Structures are given as C-alpha cells and as structure tokens.
Write a protein that binds this ligand. Structure first.
Ligand SMILES: *[C@@H]1O[C@H](CO)[C@@H](O[C@@H]2O[C@H](CO)[C@@H](O[C@@H]3O[C@H](CO)[C@@H](O)[C@H](O)[C@@H]3O)[C@H](O)[C@H]2NC(C)=O)[C@H](O)[C@H]1NC(C)=O
Ligand SMILES: *[C@@H]1O[C@H](CO)[C@@H](O[C@@H]2O[C@H](CO)[C@@H](O[C@@H]3O[C@H](CO)[C@@H](O)[C@H](O)[C@@H]3O)[C@H](O)[C@H]2NC(C)=O)[C@H](O)[C@H]1NC(C)=O
Ligand SMILES: *[C@@H]1O[C@H](CO)[C@@H](O[C@@H]2O[C@H](CO)[C@@H](O[C@@H]3O[C@H](CO)[C@@H](O)[C@H](O)[C@@H]3O)[C@H](O)[C@H]2NC(C)=O)[C@H](O)[C@H]1NC(C)=O
Ligand SMILES: *[C@@H]1O[C@H](CO)[C@@H](O[C@@H]2O[C@H](CO)[C@@H](O[C@@H]3O[C@H](CO)[C@@H](O)[C@H](O)[C@@H]3O)[C@H](O)[C@H]2NC(C)=O)[C@H](O)[C@H]1NC(C)=O
Lengths: 104, 438, 438
C-alpha cells in the first residue's frame, strides 16, 4: 500500500526507494452536481456521504417547516369564517384554496 | 528590523518568507532544511558479550585426599570425588586401588573478542535537535549548521538568525535501548546483578575494560566416568548467541515518520515532525529604497492551465503597467498555492509569467508584484499519473474557494430555500397582524 | 522469603526492619545510609576565559599609500591613516613632507593560560542518585555501594537487596549552571554567538581545544598623535574580570536541605529528602526454627526514667518467665519510640533492660521480645539543654497518647458535657412523649 504520505521498501543490498501517491480519482469536477459528488467521493470516501446526508436532511427539515407554516397560517386565517353562518368571499377562495370548492 | 516566522520541518520544502518594511520595497527570503539530527542523551548501564568456560586440568591426588578451596571467581564451581582409578596410555598410575581422589575446577570468564563484538544497554532521554539550513536572498547563497533551540545565533551576511525550539517533543526512542553495531532496539533488559541464564544478559560487565563480572549460567559439575580423566560438566548455552538469532525486528525498519536511525552516535535523521520558529534581524543594506523600485499599477492576474499535481502544475500570467524596468519580489499570501520563483524580471512590455502548485480543486489567492496586488481564481483538473517518486511541493490544502462551482451550487440552493422560508415568515406575520388588529 | 519496606533518607539514622515468618522466629535488620550523592547530567555549552589583545607593529609607508585588507580573525579591526610625519630617536624619516601613510592593525585572541583558568557553562537535567548503605544482621556486617533506582540488585551474604527509586524528584540545580573551579552557580548565561561586551561571555569558545572563537569587545582604533609611532586604541575591559568580582553568592552556601555542593564531577552529597523503598529476598538459613528459640511468656513492661531529648534518654525494662536461655530480637512497632539495640540476651533471671529515644510528652508503644508482646507507657519530662551538636535520633512525632494526662482531662470534661446533653435530651423526649400521649 502507498498512501498519500508515501512509503519505502528495501530489496536486497540496494538502497531504499521511496514512492509517493498522488491525488487522482475517477470523477469529474466542475460539472453537474452528480459528478462533483463522485469526484469528492474518490477522495476521502467517508466524509462526502456524511456531508451530503446532512445537507439533504437540513433541506428537508427547512422545506417541511415552511410548508407546515403555510398550512397553519391558512388555517388560522380561514377559521373565523367557519364560526358564523356567513359566506366564503370568493376573492379569498381564489387565493386560499379550501375544502369547500363550491358548496358553502 | 526584527522579524519572526514559522517554517515547516520538512526536508526540501521551499519555504519563502515575506518582509514588508514601510520605508522600503518588499523583500523575499528562501529557507530550506537540508539535514536534521535528533540526538538523545545516553547513560551506559552494562555490556554483554559471549562468555567462555575455563576448565583447568584435574589434580588426581592419590594415596591421600584433597579438600576444595573457595575462590572469588565468577560462577566458580569445585568438587572433590572419591574412588577414581584413572588410566593413561602406558597404563594406570596411582597404585592405591580405591584410595584416590580427583579435584574438578571450572568457572566463567569474559571472551577474548568481547572488545570487538558486544552489545550495549543504554538509557535514553531528553533528545537534542540539530539541523543544517540553506538560506538565500538577494544575491546571498550559503548553508549553515544550527542547534535547533532558542540559544544559538548565527550570522549570515550581516543578518542574525535564531532558530527557536521545536514545536513538538516527540522522540522515537523508548526509555531503554539496546545498541548493536548499527541497529537500535526498543528492548527492556534485566537489571544489573539479576540476569537469568540462557537469555539476554546472562553475563554482565559495567564497562568493556572493567574488572568486575557477574555471571549466572548454571554451571554444574558431574562425576567422571570410571577409568578416564576428563572433568565432565554441563552448562546452559550462551544467552548472547541466542539473542542474536531471535532479537526480532529493529528500529531502523520500525521508526515512524520515515526517519532513518544511525549509530555512533545514536541519532535519528531527516525526521519530519513539527514546526521550527525563526527569529531574524536584518540590516538596512539588504532592502531597497522605494524610489529605486519600479512603480506597478493596474495589476491583473490570469491562469492558463491548472492541474493540482505534486509538481508545479500551474501557469500564471500577470499584466501590468510600469514606468521603468527592474526587479520585483513575488509572493503569494495564502498557503493554498506555492510559487516557484521569489523574484521576477519586470519590463515595459507588461507581461510576466509564474509557476505555482496547488492541491485544491478551485484555488483562490492574492499575489503581489513589488507593491501591487491582484486576485487569482482558477479551475484545476486532476492529474492522470497514479504514483510519482518525489514529494509534494504544496501545503496539502483541499477545501475549495467559496466562489467555486460546488460552493456556488450550495449557495444557490441555500438562497432559494431561504427565500421560501422568508416568504413563509412574511405571510404568517401578515396573517397574525391582521388577526391581532381585529 | 520476599519482603518490602520503606526507610527514611536521613544520614546516620539507625533504621530497623522486622521480619516475621510464620514458621520461624522473628528477625531484625539494621540498615544505615552512610553517604549519598546526587549526580546530574551535563551538556557543555561554551568556555569563557580572559582575552588578550594582539597589536602588531605599524607599517609606515614613506612617499606612498596603502590599502586595508579584510581578514577572518575574531574582532579584527584595521584602519589606514594619511598625512602622518613620524619621528625616531636619531631623527625623522619619510622625507616626503605630507605624502606618508600609516596602517594600524589589531585583533583579539584567547589568552595563553585559558586552559588553566576558565569558567564552564553547562545545562543540567535528570539528576541520578547514588548511595552507600551499611547492612548488618545476625553475624553479617558489610557496606555496599548501590544505585538508588529499581534496576540494581546487590548481594550481601546470600540476600538480594533492591533499593527502589527515590520518593521525590527534587534537585537543587537549575536548568542552567556555571561552574568555576570548585563552585557552582545558578546563573542564566547569554546564548552562544550573542554575547555582550563587558559582561560574562564577551568571548566564547565551543571547547577549550576548539579552533573557532567568537569575540565582541568593541575594539576601536584612533588616529595617532603628530610625530609619534604608538598605534592608539580603546577597548572595553574583559567581562570575565567583572564577573569574577561581581558574581555574587554561590550554591555551596545557599543549597537547601543542608547538602554540600562539590565539583569534578558536579554532585550534591548527603542531601536529606524523601524515602527510599527497599525490596529484599532472604534465604532460609538466616532465620531460626521456632523450636530452637526460647519461649517467652508473661511479659510486663515498666519504664524507669524518660526524657524526650535528642539522644537515647529513656530506660526501659522487661520481666518474663522463660524455659531456656538464648537470644531474641526486640523491636518497637510504633515510630513514636526508637530502640537502640536489636538483640537482647535472654536469661532465666527474667529481667532485661533496653534504651529508647522519644520526642513526645507521653508515648505509648508496643514492644515484642521473641514472640511475646507488651504495651509500654510512661511520663516524660523536658530536657534542660537548649542546644546540642548532634542530630535527633527520634522520628520527631509530638502528638501524645489518648491515655496521657492532658487527653485524660479532655476526655473527662467531654464526658461530663456529654452526660449533661444526654440528660437534657432524655428530659425533652420524655416531656414531648407525655404531651403527645394526651
Ligand atoms: C607406595 O605405595 C604404597 C602402597 O601400599 C603407599 O602406601 C600407602 O600410603 C598411604 C599414605 O599414608 C596410606 O594411606 C593411609 O591409610 C590409612 C588406613 O590404612 C589411613 O589411616 C591414613 O590416614 C592414610 O590415608 C595407604 O594405606 C598405604 N597403602 C597401604 C596398602 O597401606 C605409599 O604411600 C606409596 N609411596 C608414595 C611415596 O606414595
Ligand atoms: C547555492 O549553492 C548551491 C550549491 O552550490 C546551488 O545548488 C547547485 O545548483 C547547480 C545548478 O545551478 C547544480 O548543478 C547541477 O546539478 C544537477 C543535479 O541533477 C546536475 O545534474 C547538473 O549536472 C549540475 O551539476 C548543483 O548540483 C546544485 N548543488 C546542490 C548541492 O544541489 C544553488 O543553485 C545556489 N543558489 C542559487 C540561487 O543559485
Ligand atoms: C627619494 O625621495 C624622493 C622625494 O621627492 C621620492 O620621490 C617621490 O616618489 C614617490 C613614488 O611613489 C612619489 O609618489 C607619487 O607621487 C605622484 C604625484 O604626486 C602620485 O600620483 C603617485 O600616486 C605617488 O604618490 C612622490 O611624488 C615623489 N616625490 C616628489 C616627486 O617630490 C623618492 O621616491 C625617494 N626614493 C625612494 C623612496 O626610494
Ligand atoms: C560493622 O562493621 C563496621 C566496619 O565495617 C564497624 O565499624 C567500626 O566502627 C567503630 C566505631 O564507629 C570504629 O572504631 C573507631 O575507630 C577509630 C579509629 O581511629 C577510633 O578513633 C574511634 O574512637 C572508634 O573506636 C571501627 O574502626 C569500625 N570498624 C572498621 C572501620 O573496620 C562496626 O562496628 C561493625 N558493627 C559492630 C556491631 O561492631
């Protein structure tokens, strides 16, 4: 094995010979997002996966929180109209979609 | 003008230091570590070598008796036997048929060649580092030898240099060491006066010429066979010869950080670890007045090709506008890129070229030519050769710039998500305010 | 029979160890530290001695001029003067009225007697201890030289002794040491190659035999007077003579714990601190079978007189009943009292006397004769002499026995107060129980 640090071997009476590895891989940088991941997975194939999973999880958490907040805001805005025998105000119906499409 | 810096303790690394005096043009020095030596301090414990059994001729006293006499000899053994009837080639002497005695004697002694082939037992502590450094600046070459500790000042062409103590205190030698010819072993040897037969240290001497000797080889005598004169004995084989055959490995093929162990004196050479602080004191003759240095304006930086390989695999181009032609000092202010040259020829044409090596996909650094500044960004492709026989010439920094392609994509996605969340917050706040104002 | 003990590192203190094999009569050892020695490890830095200024004859060039030539000499100074008109005893030469020239030259070199009067500059670390212990028991009495570290076993009459490492790691030498003849100084000397004129280290040499030399004494030349040939110069006096007159104090008359500092080699002798553990390995011939030793029953201890002085100021007696006469081994199982003898000759008369030294007003200790046992207690009066010229022979413990007079008074008072408190508690409990039952 020849890691990036390098190594030496001693064969017979010859002098020791040292060999050093080099930063080479099989991915393609400066391309589509699915190629940079391969390029940075060729190097250090234990932190790239963790970073990708963390970023994806954070994005999912943020988008779920935002969607829930929109739903809660709509529910808070529309619930006063349900406590009275009133109308739907089709102006608000167009912008805010509700369960009653046309019936009340 | 006093100055201070830190340089890596890697042999052959082209370290370059930048000095920016506010009344003079900037100067660039080059320092390179050619050779180092980690020197431990040794205390001799004892000396071991192959032994040799001395067995004097028997004294067959017959028609009488003999008594054993004690002596102060190492591992001495003596006994007296009764009823011997020895024989010789011409016949059997000692007329008395059964009233004869034989006295056997034997002891141990240090061998004849112990002063050419012996093993030493040492105690090692408090290593001392010594180095040989090459410095060049302006027109001054030369190499010097320096003790690496904060108490040795060497003058090189009017400049005083003090190399500070090493950052780390790591030594490859354990507390106890056994040295043989040109091999060092991390071994735990038995204490003086408590050696066991058949293993290392069965016989011990405080020094090669010392008279005292402690030998424990379990020498035991036996009764001679009838009708012969031979003084039989039995003895456990030598422990030094055993140790020669099953010592196992060494420290020359075991030491970390790839540093060769040598002997006489015991030392570890070219052993890369830690940082070496440097303290400097330069005279006024080394610098150049700012009026004499050419004025550089409108400095722009461009990159032709970039491959983050171990060798200098990058080409850089600088465009500028000057009034006169002279010499500038070229430096890079970030360790992500290392320049090959420290001085460049400036001309009225307005184009100079430089070579740099990087280890990151998208490097970004600031380069200065005399007093001007410029920012360089590049896109580098990986190399194709898997293995090379020379060390890396970069600082091994992998993290790309914030303006790189991957970081740009991350920025775009994060900005989109943040905009969505901000819109969510605004809608919720508007609805809550409308509800509260009711 | 393996054994272990801990004995104080005080010179001349008669330590006694008790060994009690279950199958044999008890044995008592006596070990005494005759002399110690603390050996530091030194690294030579440089050698300083008085300098000597070498000034050659001037070269007066009549009707011409001369040019200065640089040389590689320690603190070399050469200058050329013009317009000189020298004289001599019989007349004036250099017929040319004003076109003459004198070349002045001077430099510094190490003195003639530097190999006899010089001061060294060392670095001291990792002190090593050395001792000389006298061991006596039974019919054995010898003195041995032992390294105080658990890697040296010495045999005394078939018994193996291993003296463990010192309890503490205190050393009186600082990191930097200056040695002159037979004196040691705790000083911080300037680094090599950076000495200042007029103080210690104005000229420095790596070794007395070394060829190189670094000198800095600010030697400066001056223009000669008209009509004279003398080569004027001025120089700051030697820093060695300033140091020799203003060194200040020493370590011989300043070391703590009352230990003398000696030189060649550098060492500190008889320096009391810490404890030295002892490991032993005794043969089966040293003890005596319990059937052979006399049997002692009905042991009673009485004290005639007591006086807690430095010497053995206590007289103690034993009464017993025995079947046969022989030898026992007396011992005190507490360090409050230290006995004088480790063997008392037992006779059928049933009365032996012993001496002991104590440092407490009322001591209480348990003493054993052969296999017997008894508890001793006495009242001791202070001594009258204010100052004595010999060291204390006791362990210097002051707290008295719980059965002494003062503690008896304290116990009686505390018991009375506790009885009062218990009575009050009982009254309160009875009253509150009666109140609760209603
Ligand atoms: C020449 O040969 C004769 C052979 O008889 C030697 O005579 C032997 O001399 C030894 C020395 O005294 C005798 O040993 C003694 O034995 C008695 C017990 O008998 C013992 O009590 C003494 O302490 C001593 O050990 C030995 O007995 C005797 N031989 C006989 C048969 O009696 C003679 O010594 C020889 N000449 C020389 C110069 O050796
Ligand atoms: C300061 O001094 C050093 C040592 O004199 C200079 O290094 C030396 O540089 C020359 C080339 O300028 C080397 O000569 C060539 O070396 C190669 C090595 O493969 C050989 O194949 C050629 O035939 C030729 O001899 C010389 O070896 C080299 N010395 C060492 C010890 O490496 C250095 O260049 C000087 N500083 C400056 C700024 O010039
Ligand atoms: C005997 O005495 C006469 C005195 O005149 C010496 O003549 C002097 O010779 C020196 C030779 O170096 C002349 O010095 C030179 O002078 C010229 C012009 O000033 C200058 O350019 C040179 O650099 C050099 O210093 C000196 O002038 C001359 N004196 C005169 C002409 O009055 C003569 O050398 C003596 N003979 C000896 C010393 O053997
Ligand atoms: C165990 O052996 C040591 C010696 O290995 C004995 O030391 C002896 O100690 C006494 C008193 O400390 C020495 O006597 C002195 O002699 C000098 C001679 O000038 C005299 O001036 C003094 O007044 C005193 O009488 C004696 O020389 C010395 N023995 C030697 C040095 O061989 C020790 O006494 C032995 N243990 C016992 C219990 O005897």
């Amino acid at each position: 094995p020849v890691p990036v640090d390098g190594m030496e071997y001693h064969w017979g009476n010859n002098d020791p010979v040292r060999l050093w590895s080099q930063l080479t891989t099989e991915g393609k940088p400066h391309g589509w997002p699915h190629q940079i991941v391969q390029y940075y997975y060729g190097l250090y194939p234990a932190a790239t996966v963790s970073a990708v999973v963390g970023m994806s999880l954070l994005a999912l958490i943020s988008i779920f929180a935002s969607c829930y907040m929109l739903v809660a805001a709509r529910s808070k805005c529309l619930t006063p109209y349900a406590l009275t025998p009133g109308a739907a105000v089709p102006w608000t119906l167009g912008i805010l979609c509700c369960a009653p499409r046309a019936h009340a | 003008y006093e100055h201070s810096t830190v340089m890596p303790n890697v042999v052959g690394f082209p370290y370059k230091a930048h000095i920016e005096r506010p009344g003079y043009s900037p100067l660039t020095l080059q320092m390179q570590v050619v050779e180092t030596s980690l020197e431990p301090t040794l205390n001799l414990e004892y000396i071991t070598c192959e032994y040799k059994t001395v067995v004097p001729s028997p004294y067959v006293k017959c028609c009488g008796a003999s008594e054993c006499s004690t002596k102060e000899k190492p591992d001495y053994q003596c006994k007296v036997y009764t009823g011997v009837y020895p024989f010789m080639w011409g016949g059997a002497y000692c007329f008395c048929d059964s009233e004869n005695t034989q006295l056997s004697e034997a002891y141990v002694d240090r061998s004849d060649v112990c002063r050419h082939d012996h093993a030493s037992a040492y105690k090692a502590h408090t290593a001392s580092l010594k180095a040989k450094v090459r410095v060049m600046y302006g027109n001054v070459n030369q190499t010097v030898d320096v003790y690496v500790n904060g108490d040795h000042a060497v003058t090189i062409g009017g400049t005083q240099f003090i190399f500070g103590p090493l950052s780390s205190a790591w030594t490859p030698f354990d507390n106890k060491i056994v040295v043989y010819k040109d091999e060092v072993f991390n071994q735990d040897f038995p204490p003086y006066g408590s050696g066991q037969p058949g293993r290392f240290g069965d016989i011990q001497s405080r020094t090669v010429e010392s008279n005292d000797l402690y030998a424990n080889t379990a020498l035991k005598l036996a009764r001679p066979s009838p009708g012969m004169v031979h003084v039989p004995y039995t003895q456990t084989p030598s422990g030094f010869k055993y140790w020669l055959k099953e010592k196992g490995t060494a420290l020359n093929t075991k030491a970390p950080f790839g540093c060769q162990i040598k002997t006489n004196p015991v030392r570890a050479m070219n052993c890369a670890v830690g940082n070496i602080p440097v303290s400097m004191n330069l005279p006024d003759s080394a610098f150049t007045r700012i009026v004499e240095a050419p004025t550089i304006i409108d400095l722009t930086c461009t990159v032709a090709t970039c491959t983050h390989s171990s060798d200098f695999g990058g080409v850089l181009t600088l465009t500028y506008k000057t009034d006169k032609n002279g010499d500038c000092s070229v430096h890079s202010h970030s360790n992500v890129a290392t320049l090959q040259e420290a001085t460049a020829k400036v001309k009225t044409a307005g184009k100079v070229t430089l070579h740099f090596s990087t280890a990151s996909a998208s490097p970004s650094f600031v380069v200065s030519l005399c007093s001007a500044r410029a920012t360089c960004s590049a896109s580098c492709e990986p190399p194709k050769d898997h293995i090379v026989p020379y060390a890396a010439s970069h600082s091994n920094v992998v993290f790309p710039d914030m303006s790189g392609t991957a970081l740009s994509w991350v920025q775009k996605i994060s900005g989109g998500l943040g905009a969505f969340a901000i819109g969510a917050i605004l809608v919720l706040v508007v609805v809550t305010c409308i509800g509260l104002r009711r």
